[PDB]
Amino acid sequence: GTLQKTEDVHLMGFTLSGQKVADSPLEASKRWAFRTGVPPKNVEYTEGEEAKTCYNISVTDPSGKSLLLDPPSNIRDYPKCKTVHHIQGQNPHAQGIALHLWGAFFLYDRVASTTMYRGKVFTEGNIAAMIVNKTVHRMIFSNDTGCFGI
Amino acid sequence: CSGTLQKTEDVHLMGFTLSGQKVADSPLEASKRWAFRTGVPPKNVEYTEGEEAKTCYNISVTDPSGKSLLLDPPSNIRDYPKCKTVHHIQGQNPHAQGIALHLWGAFFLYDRVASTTMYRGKVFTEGNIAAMIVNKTVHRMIFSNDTGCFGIL
Amino acid sequence: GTLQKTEDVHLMGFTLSGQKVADSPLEASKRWAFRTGVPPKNVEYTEGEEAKTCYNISVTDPSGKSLLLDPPSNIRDYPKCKTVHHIQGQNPHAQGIALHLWGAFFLYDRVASTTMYRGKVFTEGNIAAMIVNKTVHRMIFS
Amino acid sequence: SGTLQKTEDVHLMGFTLSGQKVADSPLEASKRWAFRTGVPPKNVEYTEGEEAKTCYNISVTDPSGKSLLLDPPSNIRDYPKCKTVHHIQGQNPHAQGIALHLWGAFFLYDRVASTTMYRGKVFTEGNIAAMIVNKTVHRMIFS
Amino acid sequence: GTLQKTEDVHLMGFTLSGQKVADSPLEASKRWAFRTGVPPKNVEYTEGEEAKTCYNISVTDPSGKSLLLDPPSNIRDYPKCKTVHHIQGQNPHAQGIALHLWGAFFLYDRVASTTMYRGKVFTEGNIAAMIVNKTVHRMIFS
Amino acid sequence: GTLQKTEDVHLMGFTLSGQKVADSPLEASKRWAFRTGVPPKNVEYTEGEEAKTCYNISVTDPSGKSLLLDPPSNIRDYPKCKTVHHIQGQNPHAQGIALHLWGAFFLYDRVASTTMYRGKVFTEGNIAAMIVNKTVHRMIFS
Amino acid sequence: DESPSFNTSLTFSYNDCDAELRIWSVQEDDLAAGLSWIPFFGPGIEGLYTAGLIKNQNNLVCRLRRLANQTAKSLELLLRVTTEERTFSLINRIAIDFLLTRWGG
Amino acid sequence: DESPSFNTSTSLTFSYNDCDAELRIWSVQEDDLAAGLSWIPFFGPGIEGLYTAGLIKNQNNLVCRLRRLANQTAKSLELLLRVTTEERTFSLINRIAIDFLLTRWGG
Amino acid sequence: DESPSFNTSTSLTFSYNDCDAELRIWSVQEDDLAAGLSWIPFFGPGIEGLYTAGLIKNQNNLVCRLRRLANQTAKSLELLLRVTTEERTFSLINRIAIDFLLTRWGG
Amino acid sequence: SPSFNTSTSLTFSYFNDCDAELRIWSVQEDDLAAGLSWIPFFGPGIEGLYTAGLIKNQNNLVCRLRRLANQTAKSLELLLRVTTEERTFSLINRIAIDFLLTRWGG
Amino acid sequence: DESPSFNTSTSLTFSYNDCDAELRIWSVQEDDLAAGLSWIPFFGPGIEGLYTAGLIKNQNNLVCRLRRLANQTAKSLELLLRVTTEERTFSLINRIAIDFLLTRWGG
Amino acid sequence: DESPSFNTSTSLTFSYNDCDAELRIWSVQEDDLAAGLSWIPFFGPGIEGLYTAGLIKNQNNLVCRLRRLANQTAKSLELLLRVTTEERTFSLINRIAIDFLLTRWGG
Ligand SMILES: *[C@@H]1O[C@H](CO)[C@@H](O[C@@H]2O[C@H](CO)[C@@H](O[C@@H]3O[C@H](CO[C@H]4O[C@H](CO)[C@@H](O)[C@H](O)[C@@H]4O)[C@@H](O)[C@H](O[C@H]4O[C@H](CO)[C@@H](O)[C@H](O)[C@@H]4O)[C@@H]3O)[C@H](O)[C@H]2NC(C)=O)[C@H](O)[C@H]1NC(C)=O
Ligand SMILES: *[C@@H]1O[C@H](CO)[C@@H](O[C@@H]2O[C@H](CO)[C@@H](O[C@@H]3O[C@H](CO[C@H]4O[C@H](CO)[C@@H](O)[C@H](O)[C@@H]4O)[C@@H](O)[C@H](O[C@H]4O[C@H](CO)[C@@H](O)[C@H](O)[C@@H]4O)[C@@H]3O)[C@H](O)[C@H]2NC(C)=O)[C@H](O)[C@H]1NC(C)=O
Ligand SMILES: *[C@@H]1O[C@H](CO)[C@@H](O[C@@H]2O[C@H](CO)[C@@H](O[C@@H]3O[C@H](CO[C@H]4O[C@H](CO)[C@@H](O)[C@H](O)[C@@H]4O)[C@@H](O)[C@H](O[C@H]4O[C@H](CO)[C@@H](O)[C@H](O)[C@@H]4O)[C@@H]3O)[C@H](O)[C@H]2NC(C)=O)[C@H](O)[C@H]1NC(C)=O
Ligand SMILES: *[C@@H]1O[C@H](CO)[C@@H](O[C@@H]2O[C@H](CO)[C@@H](O[C@@H]3O[C@H](CO[C@H]4O[C@H](CO)[C@@H](O)[C@H](O)[C@@H]4O)[C@@H](O)[C@H](O[C@H]4O[C@H](CO)[C@@H](O)[C@H](O)[C@@H]4O)[C@@H]3O)[C@H](O)[C@H]2NC(C)=O)[C@H](O)[C@H]1NC(C)=O
Ligand SMILES: *[C@@H]1O[C@H](CO)[C@@H](O[C@@H]2O[C@H](CO)[C@@H](O[C@@H]3O[C@H](CO)[C@@H](O)[C@H](O)[C@@H]3O)[C@H](O)[C@H]2NC(C)=O)[C@H](O)[C@H]1NC(C)=O
Ligand SMILES: *[C@@H]1O[C@H](CO)[C@@H](O[C@@H]2O[C@H](CO)[C@@H](O[C@@H]3O[C@H](CO)[C@@H](O)[C@H](O)[C@@H]3O)[C@H](O)[C@H]2NC(C)=O)[C@H](O)[C@H]1NC(C)=O
Ligand SMILES: *[C@@H]1O[C@H](CO)[C@@H](O[C@@H]2O[C@H](CO)[C@@H](O[C@@H]3O[C@H](CO)[C@@H](O)[C@H](O)[C@@H]3O)[C@H](O)[C@H]2NC(C)=O)[C@H](O)[C@H]1NC(C)=O
Ligand SMILES: *[C@@H]1O[C@H](CO)[C@@H](O[C@@H]2O[C@H](CO)[C@@H](O[C@@H]3O[C@H](CO)[C@@H](O)[C@H](O)[C@@H]3O)[C@H](O)[C@H]2NC(C)=O)[C@H](O)[C@H]1NC(C)=O
Ligand SMILES: *[C@@H]1O[C@H](CO)[C@@H](O[C@@H]2O[C@H](CO)[C@@H](O[C@@H]3O[C@H](CO)[C@@H](O)[C@H](O)[C@@H]3O)[C@H](O)[C@H]2NC(C)=O)[C@H](O)[C@H]1NC(C)=O
Ligand SMILES: *[C@@H]1O[C@H](CO)[C@@H](O[C@@H]2O[C@H](CO)[C@@H](O[C@@H]3O[C@H](CO)[C@@H](O)[C@H](O)[C@@H]3O)[C@H](O)[C@H]2NC(C)=O)[C@H](O)[C@H]1NC(C)=O
C-alpha cells in the first residue's frame, strides 16, 4: 500500500458495547477472574470510541486490603463515558491478579491492559491497527455481592 | 417604560446547572452537599427549559433492613433529558432518618421539574432556575454496598 | 368588547355529532388508536352540548387485563346522552394508551381528556372559549 | 381606588365560631354536623388564622368496625393552636356518606379549610375572609 | 545524503546563550511559570553545547517542602558549566510544576526535559536533529 | 540475506560453562569485582542455554545490609540450572557496584545485565544474534 | 386560542353545522333559594344542571362550532407543554392575556 | 368573594353581641423574613415551629366587622367551590388579583 | 423574585470570571406547526423526541449575568415555596404576569 | 498484527454483531498548533486535549474494523507474552518496519 | 554486532578445542495456537511452564561458530550499552532490523 | 523533525547575523578503544572522564544553519511529546531512521 510517514499508523480501541455484547454489571462480571502466576502487560494506543458503559470497581479481602494492583503513573481514567457504574465487593478465597476470560483488554486513557487497576475507570474492548492517508483522514472524519469467585 | 410582556406564552425560564458555575461536580465531593432531615415537607416547582448538564447521578440509599430512604417519585417525575455522564452509586446509611435535602439552596433538577428532595431511581442534576422575559423575535434571533453515604452533620 | 369579572368567561364543549359526522359505533371506531410514549392530559370546561350518541367501551387483552386506564376521582360520566352504546371487544396487538386520530377530545363531566378511560361514558367533541357577561346572557339563553 | 402592589399582599384569615359567641361545648356542637351522600368534598387554601379556644378530635365507626370518615390526604395536618382538645369516640349504625356542616361553616385545619371531616386530624369550626394589607400597615397594626 | 547505519543520527542541543539572549537570573524568572495539569516529558539526546551560565534553583513554601518534582535516576547534573549560580528562593503563591514560556528545554546530562527538578544543574536550550557519517565528522573535530 | 518478518531475529545466551572455563565457585570469584560510579545496564534476549552451574550469592557489610542492588520487577531467576551454589560472604573493604572483569553478562530470565542483583539466581554468559526463518528453525530444533 | 366577545346588531370581535343548539348549564336560580347554597342542602351531582337552548339569530351557532374546531388545534399544543396529568384550568390564562393585550391597545 | 382594602389615611379610610374584641392570631414570620441560613429548609424552622403569635388591637372597630365579613364570605365561597370538580387544595389569591385588575380598569 | 427584560434595538438594553461563556440548552420547540399534523398526539414526537438543542451566544455577557441571576433568585424562590402546602408542582407564570401588571403604573 | 489499509475509502487492502454508528475521540494536531498554543503552559490539560467526531459507514467500514478488533487480538496477546517489560510497549515502529520488510526483501 | 543468516540446503549456508559440540536450548514455543484457548492469559501456561527444551545438532560446524560469535558480540554491545543512559529495557531487535534494512538497500 | 546532511566536495552541501562564531563541544568517545581493554565496564572511564572536548569551525556558515534549526525542531517536538503518555526517556533515532526510509521509498 501507501505509507509516507510514521504517525499516520493508527491504533484505535473499539469497545464491546458497540459489538452488541450485553454489558450490564450484574452479568458482565463473569468475564473476569483471578489467577496467580502471570505478569501484567500494557500496550499504548492512540484513539478510541465513546463508551456506553464504564466501571469503577473495588474488590477487597475480609481483612480490608484491596486485591487489585496499584496503578502505575501512566494509567489514567477513560476519557469519555456515558454511564459510570460504581461497584464494591469482597472475595475471601481468591488470590492473584484480575484477568479477562475472553482475552479482551481493559481500556484506559490510551493504555490497554491485561489486568485491572485499583481506583481507575476502564472499559472492555480491543485495539485495532490501520494505515490511513492525511487527505483520507480529512475525508472520512467529521459490599454489593461476591463478584468474580469463579 | 419597558412593557415587553404582550402575551403569556413568552415563557422562557431556564434552569442553570452548577457545573457551569465552576462548582466541583465529582461524585465524591458532591455528596457533601446532601443530608437527611425529618420534619420538612417536599416541594416541587415547574420549569420549562434549561441547560444540558455535564454530570448526572443515579443514587439509591438503603438501611440495614433493606428499605430505601428516598421518597417514591410522582407520575410527573422523569429522568433528566441531557446528561453527558451518568454516575450510578449504590450505598447505605444506618443512622439517618427523614428525607434528603441540599445544604446550599440548589434544586434537584429533573425533566421540567425542580425539587428540594431526591426520588427513588431517578436521574437528576443540581441547578437553580431563573425567570425572565423575551419575546418571539429575540429568541428566534439568538436561539442557535458503599455505606456511610451522605455522612452526617 | 369588555370583560368585567373572571367568571364571565365560558368554555363550551360542542360535539362532533352536531358537525354532520357519522356516529355509528362501527364507523366511529376507526378514529381511535393505541400508542405508547405520550402522557395523558386533562382540561377543565364549564358547560357544553349534550350528544346524540355516547359510548361505554371496555377493551381487554386475551389474558383479561383492560388496556384502558383507571379513572381518576374527578372523572365522571357524561351528563346527558340520548343514546348510550355498550361495545366490548379484544385486541391482542394493541399496547399503550388510547388516542383520537382527528385530534378531538373525549368529553366527560366538565373534564375533556386526550385519552379513553375504563367504565366511563364519554363523547367526542371540541371545546371553545368565549366571553359573554350576565347582562345579555339571558337574552340568548332560553 | 385601591392599594394592591404585590400578589402576596392578599391575606386569607380564618376566624373561629367560638369568637362569635357561639356555643362550642361538644354536647351542643354535634348538632351542626350531619351525613350525606352525593356531594364531593372541597378544600381551599388560606394563609393565617385565629388562635382557637376549643378544638375536636373525632372518630366515628360502624358496628362492622370501619370508619365513616374519609382518609386524610397528605395536605391535611393538625390545627396549629388549640387551647383545649376534645376527644370523642362514637358509633353511628345508620349513617352513610360524608360528614357535612349544617351552618355552611368550614372545618379549619393547618392553612386548609374543608367542607368535610377527616380521620385522625384535629380541626375547628370557622370561616375565612380575604383582605389586602401591605407591609407597613401590617407592621403598624399587627403587634 | 545517505546514512549507512543508525548510529549516524546525531542530536546536538544548543543553548539559548548563543543567540545573545540575556541570562541574568533577576530577569530570567519570567521565562518560567507554574501550572497544574501538564505531565512532564523527557527526550534522550546524544550530545549538546555547554552553557555560559547554569542554575541550581530550589523553590520553597511556608510549609517547608519543595514544590519541584523529584528527579528520576537517569537525571544527572549538567556536564560543562562556566559560572553556576546557586540560588535559593521562596514562593508562597505557586502551585503545580514548572514550565518554560518560550517552549525551550531544560537540558541536563544527555536528557532534555520540559520541567524543573530538585537540586539538579541544568541549562536552557533546544535540540536539533541531523545526520553526519564518520568521514565528515572526522574532517571536523579532529 | 533474507528477513521476511521481524520475529526472524534471535538473541541467544551462551554460557562459559560450555566453553570449558573453570566454573567452580573457588576460582569464579576473581572474575567479579566492585567499583563505584558506573551505572548498571541490562539488555533483553529471547532464548538461552541450560547451564551446568548457577549461583545464588548475597554479600553483606559489617553493619548488616547487602551491598547488592535491589532487583527490578522484571528480574527473575534463570530458567533451567543443573547445579545451584549458595554462597554467603562478607567484604568490609569494598563498596559500590558489582562488575565482571571479562565483560561477560550476568544472565537472568531473558535479561543480560552488567551487575549482580540480590536474591536472584544468575549465570555467566554472553549473547549473540542471528537471522533464521521458520523453515530452518523447524529442521534445526528437535 | 381565540376568545370572541358578544355585544348588547351583535358585533363580534375575536353542510357541517346544525342550527339547533341545546346545552346544559350550572344553576343560577339556586343562589336565590336562601338555604340551598349549603352543601348539605344542595341538589347533588345529578340535579346540578339545567337544560337550555341557544337561538340562531345572527348565525352564531355555526361560528361557535367552527370556533371549537379551530380552537382544538391551538389548545392541544398548550396541553403538550405542561407536565401535569390532572385537571388543568385555562380561565386565568385567558383573563391575564386579555389584560396584557388590553394595555397595548 | 369580596375584599376590603385596610389602608392608612396618609378616622381611618376603609373600602369595599356576636363579637369578641381580643384577637390573638398565628402568622408566618411577622418581620425579619431573611437571615443568614434560615431560608434553606435544612436549617429551617420546621413544620411545628414556623408560626409566630400576634395580637391585633380593636382600635377603630376592626375585629367585629372582620368577623361579620368572614361570616358572609361563605355564601360566595361555597358556591365558588361547588362549580369546580378538583378535590385538591385550591388557591384563590390569583382570582382576587385578577378581579382587582378587571374591576379597576372600568374604561 | 426577580424577572429581567431583554429587548433588541428600539441596542440590547436590560431591565429588572466565575462562569462559562458557552451556553448549550434544550428547548421544547420553536414552531412544530410547519409539519402540518404534528399537533395531533398520535402523530406527535413523544417524550424522547420532544426537545430541540440550541446555543445561546455570550456576545453581550448575557450568560454570566443569567447564572448570577439564578443564584440570586434561588433564596426568594425557596421563601416562596415554603409558604405553600401543596406538594404538586407549582406554576409561577401567572404569578409573574400578575406581579408585572401590578408593579408598574406610572407611564 | 493484522494491518489494514484504507486507500481509495474504496480500497480495503489487508496485510449481526455490529453497530453502524462510530463516534471517536482523538488528538487533532491540525488545529492544535494555533500559533503559540504548542507551549505546555499555553496549552490544554488532561480534560480538554481530545476532540469528538463520527465515522461514516460508507463501504461497510465500521463492521469490518470490529472484525479487525477480533482478528488482531490473538496475535497481540502472543506478542505481549514474549516480551518481559511490564510498562507500556511502543508498537507503531514495529508495524512501520514490518511494512518495509514485507514490501521489498528476499 | 554481527548477525549471521542461515539458509537451507547449500546442511546450512553460513552466509554472513574449547567449544562443546552438545548444545541444548530452551525457547518459547509457537505451536500453542493449536489449542485454541492458550493465547488467553488465564488459560496459559504461566511462568515455569512457558518454556520448551530442544537440542541443536552440529551439521556444518555451526555450534562453535555461534560460540565464537557470542564472544566478540559483547565487544560491540558493551559500547552500545555504554552510549545510552537509561538503566532498564533495551530491545535491540528493531536496531538490527533497521541496520539490516539500511545496509543492503543503501543505493 | 527535519535533518540536514553531509554532502561534501561534489565545501559542504546541506540538504534539508545573530549567531556565535566560536563553538566548542563535548561528545561521547569515538576512539576510546586504543589498548583493547578499556571497553570493560570495570576498566571504563567512569562518568567524569567520559566526555571528550573539541571545536567545530565555521566553514560554509554551518553554525548559523544549526542554531536556526532550534525553532523548527522545538515547534514540532513538543507536539510529538504531547501524543505519548510516558514520562520516561524517549529515543528519536529509530523514528528518524524509519522516516528516512519511508520518504525514500515513496515511489
Ligand atoms: C451561589 O454561588 C456561591 C459561589 O459563587 C456559593 O457560595 C458558596 O456557599 C457555600 C455554602 O455552603 C460555601 O461553603 C462554605 O464555606 C466555608 C468553608 O469552606 C471553605 O472555606 C475556605 C475556602 O478557601 C477554606 O478554609 C476551606 O477550603 C473551606 O472548606 C464554611 O463557611 C462552610 O462550612 C460549613 O459546612 C461544613 C460542613 O462540611 C461545616 O464545617 C459547617 O457547617 C460550616 O458552617 C461552607 O462549606 C462556599 O464557600 C461558597 N463559595 C464561595 C466561592 O463563596 C453559593 O452556594 C451559591 N448558591 C446556591 C448554589 O444556591
Ligand atoms: C572469549 O572471551 C573471553 C573474555 O570474554 C576470553 O577470556 C580471556 O582469556 C584470557 C586468556 O586466558 C585472559 O587473560 C589473562 O588470563 C589469565 C588468567 O589465568 C588465571 O588462571 C591461570 C591458571 O591456569 C593462572 O595463570 C592464574 O591463576 C590466572 O589468574 C591471567 O594471565 C590474566 O589475569 C591476571 O593475571 C595476573 C593476576 O593473576 C595479573 O598480573 C594480570 O594483569 C591479569 O589481571 C589475564 O586475565 C582474559 O582475562 C580473558 N578476558 C578478556 C576480556 O580478555 C577468552 O579467551 C575468549 N575465548 C576465545 C576462544 O577467544
Ligand atoms: C374540523 O372539521 C373538519 C370537517 O369539517 C375535519 O376535517 C376532517 O379531517 C380529517 C383528518 O383526518 C379528514 O380525514 C381524512 O380524509 C381522507 C379520506 O379520504 C376519503 O374521503 C375523501 C373525502 O371525503 C375522498 O377522497 C374519498 O371519499 C376518500 O375515501 C384522507 O385524506 C385521510 O386518511 C388518512 O387517515 C387514514 C386512517 O389512518 C389513513 O389511510 C392515512 O393516515 C390517511 O392519511 C383522512 O381520513 C376528513 O376528511 C376531514 N373532513 C372533511 C369533511 O373534509 C377536522 O378534523 C375537524 N377538526 C377537529 C379538530 O376535529
Ligand atoms: C526563533 O527565532 C527568533 C527570530 O526572531 C529568535 O528571536 C527571538 O524570538 C522570540 C520569540 O518570538 C522573541 O521573544 C518575543 O519578542 C518580543 C519582544 O519585543 C518586546 O520587547 C522589545 C525590547 O525588549 C521592544 O521592542 C518591545 O518592548 C516589544 O514589546 C515580544 O513579542 C515577546 O515579549 C512579550 O511577549 C508577550 C506578549 O506581550 C508577553 O506576555 C511578555 O511579557 C512580553 O512582553 C517575546 O519576548 C525574542 O525577542 C527574539 N529575540 C531577538 C533577539 O530578536 C529566537 O531566539 C528563536 N528561538 C526560540 C523562540 O526558541
Ligand atoms: C473510583 O472509586 C475510587 C474508590 O473506590 C476513587 O478513588 C478515590 O479517590 C479519592 C479522590 O482522589 C481519594 O481521596 C484522596 O485520598 C488521599 C488520602 O490520603 C489524599 O490524596 C486526598 O486527601 C483524598 O482524600 C481516595 O483515597 C480514593 N480511594 C481509593 C480507595 O483509592 C476514584 O476517585 C473513583 N473514580 C471516579 C472517577 O470517581
Ligand atoms: C437508575 O438506576 C435504576 C436502578 O434501579 C434503574 O432502574 C432499573 O432499570 C432497569 C433497566 O430498565 C430495570 O430492569 C428491568 O426491570 C423490569 C422488571 O425486571 C423488566 O422490564 C426487565 O426485565 C428489567 O429487569 C430495573 O427494574 C430498574 N429498577 C427499578 C428499581 O425500577 C434506572 O434505569 C437508572 N436510570 C437510567 C437512566 O439508567
Ligand atoms: C359502563 O360500563 C361499565 C363496565 O364496562 C359499568 O361498570 C360496572 O358497573 C356495575 C354497576 O355499578 C358494577 O357492578 C358492581 O360492582 C361492585 C363489585 O365490583 C359492587 O358495587 C356491586 O356488587 C356490583 O357488582 C361493575 O363492577 C362495573 N364494571 C366495571 C368493569 O367496572 C358501568 O356501569 C357502565 N356505565 C353505564 C352508565 O352504563
Ligand atoms: C386524634 O385521635 C387519633 C385517633 O385516635 C390519634 O391518632 C393516633 O395517634 C397515635 C399516636 O401517634 C397513633 O399510635 C401510633 O401508631 C403506630 C402503630 O402503633 C406507631 O407509629 C406508634 O407506636 C403509635 O402507637 C395511632 O395509630 C393514631 N390512630 C389513628 C387511627 O391514626 C391522634 O393522635 C389524635 N390527635 C391528637 C391527640 O392530637
Ligand atoms: C545543587 O543544589 C542542591 C541543593 O538544592 C545540592 O544538593 C545538596 O548536596 C549536598 C552535598 O552533596 C547534600 O548533602 C549531603 O546529603 C546526604 C544526606 O543524606 C549525605 O550524602 C551527606 O551527609 C550530605 O549531607 C545535600 O543533601 C543536597 N541537598 C538536597 C536538597 O538534595 C547540590 O549539591 C547542588 N549542586 C551543585 C553542583 O552545586
Ligand atoms: C538466593 O539467595 C538469597 C539470599 O538472601 C535468598 O533470599 C532469601 O530467601 C528466603 C526464602 O524465600 C527468604 O526468607 C523468607 O523471607 C520472608 C521474611 O522473613 C518471608 O517470606 C519468609 O518467612 C522467609 O523467611 C529470605 O528473606 C531471602 N533473603 C533476602 C535477603 O531477601 C534466595 O531465596 C535465593 N534464591 C534461591 C532460588 O534459593
Could you tell me which residues come within 8 angstroms of residue H36 by beta carbon, excluding any fewer than 6 positions away?
none
Q: How many CA atoms lie within 13 A of C125 on its CB side?
A: 31
User: Residue K19, class by beta-carbon neighbours within 10 Å (0-12 exposed, 13-18 middle, 19+ buried)?
Assistant: middle
CB atoms within 10 A of CB H33: 12
Phi, psi of B59 (to 5 degrees): -130, 130
Which of H39, H40, H47 minimises the CB distance to B39? H47
Shortest Cα distance from A48 to chain K (angstroms)?
23
Residues within a 6 A CB radius of ligand 1 = B 18, 32, 104-106, 128; I 18, 71, 74
Q: Take residue B78 and report the three cell numbers written for it.
A: 422523569
Identify the helix (H) or strand (E) that includes residue J93.
helix J92-103
Ligand nearest to the CA of I39: 3
* Cell numbers given for K55: 537440542
- Contacting A with CB below 8 Å, chain K residues are 39-42, 44, 46-48
The experimental technique used to determine this model is cryo-EM
Burial classification of residue A14, based on how many CB atoms lie within 10 Å of its CB (0-12 exposed, 13-18 middle, 19 or more buried): buried
CA distance E125 to E16: 5
C-alpha cell at A122: 476502564
**DSSP-derived secondary structure letter, A40:** -
Contact status, residue E6 vs residue K98, Cβ threshold 8 Å: yes
Question: Residue with the nearest Cα to atom 4 of ligand 9?
Answer: E119
In angstroms, the CA C18 to CA C16 distance is: 5
Q: How far apart are the C-alpha atoms of K48 and F80, rounded to whole Å?
A: 10
The rounded distance, in Å, linking the Cα atoms of C14 and H83 is 20
Q: What are phi and psi of C9, to 5 degrees?
A: -85, 150
In a domain, I27, yes or no: yes
Q: Where are the alpha helices (DSSP H) in chain K?
A: 63-83, 93-103
Closest by CA position to E32, among listed H43, B130, F3, J40: J40
> Does residue L92 contact residue L1 with C-beta atoms inside 8 Å?
yes
Cβ neighbours of residue I95 under 8 Å, at least 6 residues apart?
D7, H94
SS3 of A14, please? strand
Beginning with the edge strand found earlier in the chain, give each strand of the sheet holding A111-113 in spatial order: J53-55, J22-25, A47-49, A9-15, A123-131, A105-107, A111-113, A42-44, J88-89
Cα-based angle C60, C63, C67 (whole degrees, multiple of 5): 30
Chain centroid to CA F82: how far? 15
Cβ–Cβ < 8 Å for F7, F71: no
Query: DSSP alpha helices (H): ranges in L1-92?
Result: 62-67, 69-83
**Considering just the CA atoms, what is the radius of gyration of chain H in Å?**
18
Interface with chain B: mutation pick from H42, H47, H51, H94, highest number of B CBs within 10 Å: H42
Q: Order of strands, edge to edge, in the sheet holding E111-113?
A: E42-44, E111-113, E105-107, E123-127, E12-15, E47-48, L24-28, L51-55
J13 is a domain residue: no
Provide the 8-state DSSP code for F117: B
Strand partners, B83: B53
Largest CA distance in chain G: 48
Structural contact between residues F54 and F78, judged by C-beta atoms closer than 8 angstroms: yes
DSSP secondary structure string for all residues of I20-64 = -S-EEEEES-S--TTSSSTTSGGGS--STT--EEEEE--SSSHHH
Q: Tell me if E136 sits within 8 A of L13, measured CB to CB.
A: no
Residue D123 to residue D120: CA distance in whole angstroms:
10
Distance CA G81, CA G92 (A): 17
Reference G70, options D66, I33, C57; nearest CA is I33
Cβ neighbours of residue D122 closer than 8 Å, sequence gap 6 or more: D55, D56, D57, D78, D79, D82, D85
Domains in chain I, number: 1
In degrees, to the nearest 5, what angle opens at C-alpha H86 toward C-alphas H85 and H87? 115
C22 lines ligand 3 (CB under 6 A): no
Cα A72 to chain centroid distance, Å, stands at 15
**Gap between the Cα atoms of L71 and K7, Å rounded:** 50
> Whose Cα sits closest to atom 13 in ligand 10?
F119
Please list, in sequence order, all residues whose beta carbon lies within 8 angstroms of the beta carbon of residue A10, skipping any fewer than 6 positions away: A46, A47, A129, A130, A131, A132
Residues contacting A39, CB < 8 A, separation 6+: J84, J86, K47
Enclosing H/E stretch for I101: helix I93-103
Half-sphere exposure of D123 (CA within 13 A, CB side): 23
User: For chain A, how long is the longest CA-to-CA vector?
Assistant: 58
Opening angle at CA G12, ends G7 and G15, nearest 5: 125
* D61 CB within 6 A, ligand 8: no
Residues followed by a break in chain F, C–N over 2.5 Å? Answer: none
For residue G71, what is its C-alpha cell?
A: 380552537
Instruction: Answer yes or no: are the C-beta atoms of A147 and A94 closer than 8 Å.
Output: no
Q: How is residue L60 written as a grid cell?
A: 560554509
Nearest to E4 by CA among E130, E137, E131: E131
Rounded CA-CA distance H75/H64 in Å is 19
Angstrom distance (rounded) from CA H49 to CA B40: 11
For strand L51-55 and strand L24-28, is the pairing parallel, antiparallel, or unpaired? Answer: antiparallel
Q: What is the DSSP string of chain D?
A: -----SGGGEEEEEEEGGGGT---STTTSSTTEEEESS----EEE--EEEPEEEEEEEEEE-TTS-BSSBPP-TT----S-EEEEEEEEEE-SS--SEEEESSS-EEE-SSEEESS-BSS--BEEEEEEEEE--HHHHHHHH-
Contacts with I73 (C-beta within 8 Å, 6 or more apart), sequence order: B128, B129, B130, B131, I1, I2
First to last CA, chain E: 22
> Ligand 8, closest atom to CA D120?
3
CA-based nearest residue to E119, from E80, E84, E95, E91 = E84
End-to-end CA distance of chain L: 22
Of all protein residues, the one whose alpha carbon is nearest to atom 35 of ligand 7 is C119
Residues F61, F96 contacting (CB under 8 angstroms) = no
C-alpha cell at F32: 567479579
Residue with cell 532464548: F47
Nearest CA to ligand 7 atom 6: C119
Q: Which of I79, I85, I86 sits opposite H39 (nearest CB)?
A: I79
Question: Which 8-state DSSP code applies to residue A101?
Answer: T
* Cα dihedral D115, D119, D122, D125 in deg (nearest 10): 20
Residue J30 lies in a domain: yes
In a domain, L1, yes or no: no
Is C37–I39 a contact, with Cβ atoms under 8 angstroms apart? no
Q: Which of D111, H44, H88 is nearest to B40 (CA)?
A: H44
Residue in this structure with the C-alpha cell 420547540, named with its chain if needed: I29
Q: Is the CB of C20 under 6 A from ligand 3?
A: no
List the one residue out of L40, K82, L51, K91 whose CA is nearest residue F40. K82
Nearest to A114 among K41, K46, K47 (CB): K41
Beta bridge partners of F33: F99
**d(C-alpha K16, C-alpha F132), whole Å:** 12
Instruction: Using alpha carbons, select from H54, H33, H55 the residue that is nearest to residue H44.
Output: H33
- For residue H78, what is the enclosing H or E element? helix H63-83
Q: Supply the range of the domain harboring residue J69.
A: 22-103
Secondary structure letter of residue L45 according to DSSP? -
- Between the CA of residue A119 and those of A75, A78, J13, what are the distances in Å? 10, 12, 41
Residue K7: partners with Cβ closer than 8 Å, 6 or more residues away: F2, F136, K13, K15
Q: What are phi and psi of K12, to 5 degrees?
A: -135, 150
Burial class of F42 by CB neighbour count within 10 A (0 to 12, 13 to 18, 19+) = buried
What is the DSSP code (8-state) at residue F73?
T
H or E element that contains H66: helix H63-83
β-pairing, C42-44 vs G87-88, is parallel
How far is residue C54's CA from residue C83's CA, in Å, rounded to a whole number? 6
Are F110 and J97 within 8 A, CB to CB?
no
| E133/H75 Cα distance (integer angstroms) | 112
Rounded to the nearest 10 degrees, the angle between the axes of helix L93-104 and helix J92-103 is 30
Report long-range pairs for G12-18 (Cβ below 8 Å, ≥24 apart). G12/G60, G12/G63, G13/C1, G15/C20, G16/C19, G16/C20, G16/G65, G17/C18, G17/C19, G17/C20, G17/G61, G17/G62, G17/G65, G17/G66, G18/C18, G18/C19, G18/C20, G18/G61, G18/G65
What is the Cα Rg of chain F in Å?
17
Does a structural domain hold residue L52?
Answer: yes
User: Nearest C-alpha to atom 4 of ligand 6 is from which residue?
Assistant: B121
| Backbone dihedral angles phi then psi of residue F138, each to the nearest 5 degrees | -75, -25
In sequence order, what DSSP letters do the residues of B15-28 get, joined into one string?
EEESGGGT----HH
d(CA H67, CA C106): 45
Contact (CB, 8 A) for G50 and G10: no
Cell triple for residue C140?
340568548
CA separation, residue E103 to residues A28, E114, J28, J36 (Å):
46, 8, 20, 9
Q: What is the rounded distance in angstroms from the CA atom of residue H72 to the CA atom of residue H59?
A: 22
CA distances from A105 to A23, C8, J50 (A): 14, 73, 21
The greatest distance separating any two alpha carbons of chain C, rounded to the nearest whole angstrom, comes to 58
CA F81 to chain centre: 12
**Domain assignment present for J83:** yes
Instruction: Give CA–CA dist F7/F133, Å, rounded.
Output: 8
CA atoms within 13 A on the CB side of J85: 14
For chain A, percent helix, then strand, then coil, each to nearest 5? Answer: 10, 40, 50
Residues B4, B135: Cα–Cα separation, whole Å: 7
d(CA L99, CA E129): 13
Q: What nine digits make up the cell of A98?
A: 484480575
Which parts of E17-70 fold into alpha helices (H)? Answer: 25-28
Specify the residue for cell string 519511508.
L102
Q: Count the neighbouring beta carbons within 10 Å of the beta carbon of residue H96.
A: 20
Least Cα distance to B145 among B85, B71, B63, B34 occurs for B63
State how far the Cα of F73 lies from the Cα of B51, in Å rounded to an integer.
50
Q: Do chains I and E touch (3 or more CB pairs under 8 A)?
A: no
Instruction: Answer whether L98 touches K (CB < 8 Å).
Output: yes
Distance CA J70, CA J62 (A): 13
Q: What is the largest CA-CA distance in chain K?
A: 49
How far is G12 from D127, CA to CA, in rounded Å? 42
Among residues G95, I29, I43, the alpha carbon closest in space to that of C114 is found at I43
Q: Ligand 8, from D54, D55, D56, D57: best to mutate by most atoms within 8 Å of Cβ?
A: D57
CA A105 to CA A113: how far, in whole Å? Answer: 6
Q: What DSSP line would sit under G14-80, residue for residue? A: -----S-EEEEEE-SGGGGSSSTTSSTTS--SGGGEEEEEE--SSSHHHHHHHHHHHHHHHHHHHHH
